[PDB]
A paper describes a structure:
It was then discovered that APOC1 is a potent inhibitor of cholesteryl ester transferase protein (CETP), which is the crucial enzyme in the transfer of cholesterol between lipid surfaces (tissues) and lipid particles.
Although the movement of the two monomers within the dimer toward one another is slight, it significantly increases the interactions between them. Monocl-2 represents the dimer exhibiting the greatest degree of compression of the constituent monomer helices. As in Monocl-1, the hydrophobic stack interaction at one end of the dimer is fully maintained, but the opposite end of the dimer shows the two monomers pressed more closely together. In Monocl-2, the hydrophilic interactions appear a bit more certain and involve Arg39A-Ser27B, Ser43A/Glu47A-Arg 23B, and Lys 50-Glu19B/Asn16B/Asp20B. In the less hydrated (34% solvent) Monocl-1 crystals, and the even less hydrated (25% solvent) Monocl-2 crystals, dimers are so closely packed, molecule A against B of translationally related dimers, that the sheet or band is extremely dense.
Residue numbers in the entry:
A (entry chain B): 2 to 57
B (entry chain A): 5 to 55
The structure:
Amino acid sequence: PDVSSALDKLKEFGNTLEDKARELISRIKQSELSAKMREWFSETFQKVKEKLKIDS
Amino acid sequence: SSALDKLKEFGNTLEDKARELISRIKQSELSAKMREWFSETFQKVKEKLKI
């Protein structure tokens, strides 16, 4: 058996998990930006419609 | 934007569990290396002392 190789494997895993978890956070923030901009485009076009409509 | 802000807490949770895991692996490592070392030392002492 290889107790030393097993532990080193887990440190490797542990260290990657910690770095990828940080990267997950950034992908969430990207979709957040996406979702918020979709909300903003719709809202603002809604306003445009209304403003023209109440002016023919 | 609910699914996002609490998914962020998810990232933070994974990050903390990662660190914790590493801390624990290192402690296991120290423990095993001390166990091997003590055992080897005792063994050599035994041999030099003819039981």
